[PDB]
Design a protein around this ligand. Sequence first.
Ligand SMILES: OC[C@H]1O[C@@H](O[C@H]2[C@@H](OC[C@H]3O[C@@H](O[C@H]4[C@H](O)[C@@H](O)[C@H](O)O[C@@H]4CO)[C@H](O)[C@@H](O)[C@@H]3O[C@@H]3O[C@H](CO)[C@@H](O)[C@H](O)[C@H]3O)OC[C@@H](O)[C@@H]2O)[C@H](O)[C@@H](O)[C@H]1O
Ligand SMILES: [Ca+2]
Length: 140
Amino acid sequence: SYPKLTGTVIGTQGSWNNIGNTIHKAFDGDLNTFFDGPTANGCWLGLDFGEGVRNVITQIKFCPRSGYEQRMIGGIFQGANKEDFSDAVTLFTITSLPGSGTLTSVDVDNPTGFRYVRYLSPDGSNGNIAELQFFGTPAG
Ligand SMILES: OC[C@H]1O[C@@H](O[C@H]2[C@@H](OC[C@H]3O[C@@H](O[C@H]4[C@H](O)[C@@H](O)[C@H](O)O[C@@H]4CO)[C@H](O)[C@@H](O)[C@@H]3O[C@@H]3O[C@H](CO)[C@@H](O)[C@H](O)[C@H]3O)OC[C@@H](O)[C@@H]2O)[C@H](O)[C@@H](O)[C@H]1O
Ligand SMILES: [Ca+2]
């Protein structure tokens, strides 16, 4: 069990109908609040750990938006060292319906240190996710 990682929130700007459910809702510790993106497709969110910081990721936890759990199926989590994710590797792919109102935990087995991590949502999802957490350790 490694510590929860912190960083600068990055990702799709804005929110559905300008209501205010931005990417920041996925990092607030409340499983009742969620990111609702401004478009059906293309939405993503994640962390920049900072210039010169690289973490090895050992675990990811996520909670779907209540009532919209199907919108996570096919979503993937990536690590990268470029902010445009052109060097990204997939750390986990969501293949079954995540349980409602809880954090699903998945192990990651990849020794690479990453400056950036993200959740990349599937078409038709508006990026819907309630909470997103990364765990791991500074790269040696
Ligand atoms: O367009 C973005 C916009 O979507 C808004 O939701 C609309 C959308 O809902 C689809 C979604 O509905 C679930 O159920 C909702 C119901 O639609 C609501 O009216 C009601 O109040 O709550 C229930 C749940 O308690 C389904 O359970 C979801 O699975 C479903 O999502 C889709 O699932 C299919 C597979 O079944 C998948 O292929 C799609 O990709 C996925 O989208 O459409 C119906 C409208 O009534 C909804 O308004 C959403 O509320 C809003 O925040 C914004 O995200
Ligand atoms: Ca939340």
